[PDB]
């Protein structure tokens with residue numbers, strides 16, 4: 015005990031007395047997050063309620079990954095865990111997990127709405143690449159980066175909110191069910207950057223199939239060598255489609271979208287387009303690496319024991335998560 019309940023959205027948060035003035039913030043698509051005052055720390059914090067951690071295998075794996083990686087990862091561009099708790103006293107009774115994190119000011123959705131500047135943008139992308147690089151060195155490949163799981167303070171420091179997969183920003187190979195590697199996450203960063211420039215989602219598929227049409231309408235049909243890596247049913251569909259030439263990157267991202275009328279501006283316009291052209295590459299074999307995008311002229315101005323293999327039963331996930339909850 016020392017718990018009380020407050021209604022938040024359609025659910026009930028039960029939290030430690032220390033966390034006061036619970037207020038719903040951002041998208042709740044991946045669990046409800048509240049802003050709160052922590053009276054013990056005397057600071058504001060964010061509290062996420064995990065959404066039905068034991069509804070199934072998928073939810074439980076995802077709950078385990080998120081909690082474990084959030085305890086174990088420590089990096090300036092990755093959200094910090096402050097606390098973890100459950101209102102329930104025993105394993106039998108155990109159903110809810112709460113993560114308390116440092117509070118940021120907004121997600122990238124709100125920053126994309128505002129006008130574009132080069133210095134801000136390259137700083138946001140730099141930090142995105144630092145976070146992603148740090149994840150990759152730890153063996154973590156995300157796969158589901160998007161503006162609403164990236165958060166920012168008013169000073170423009172950026173943190174990645176989550177750890178992704180145990181849709182508009184998804185790499186071609188992920189969507190098409192082929193192998194994936196590190197640079198899967200480069201595709202998502204290209205989508206976000208392009209959207210910072212267009213202020214429009216680049217690839218708005220009104221379904222999972224139309225999505226693909228939107229990609230190659232703008233970028234063009236990939237080479238036959240890309241299509242040879244697809245499973246039979248997917249290759250069939252992909253290669254027997256009207257061939258698209260796509261648009262060049264200057265057409266995809268016109269002069270009117272960028273600051274103009276200074277040598278500096280026209281330079282940064284080209285450096286941004288150039289970067290865009292190496293991130294938004296359908297074939298992962300041809301797409302720039304994280305190390306390379308960080309060394310890119312647009313960005314480099316800023317240079318200075320846990321099961322992922324196995325399936326488990328819900329009860330074994332419950333115990334694995336619970337002990338993770340109880341041991342700090």
Ligand SMILES: CC(C)(C)NS(=O)(=O)c1ccc(-c2cnc3cccc(Nc4ccccn4)c3c2)cc1
Pocket residue numbers: 035037039040041047049050051058060093115116117118119120121165166175
């Ligand atoms: C927090 C109270 C006590 C209400 N006043 S405040 O000035 O400290 C403050 C209020 C709201 C936010 C706020 C609003 N919208 C957000 C949308 C997405 C992500 C956020 N930050 C966040 C989201 C998840 C995990 C960690 N940080 C948001 C914060 C930040 C400070």
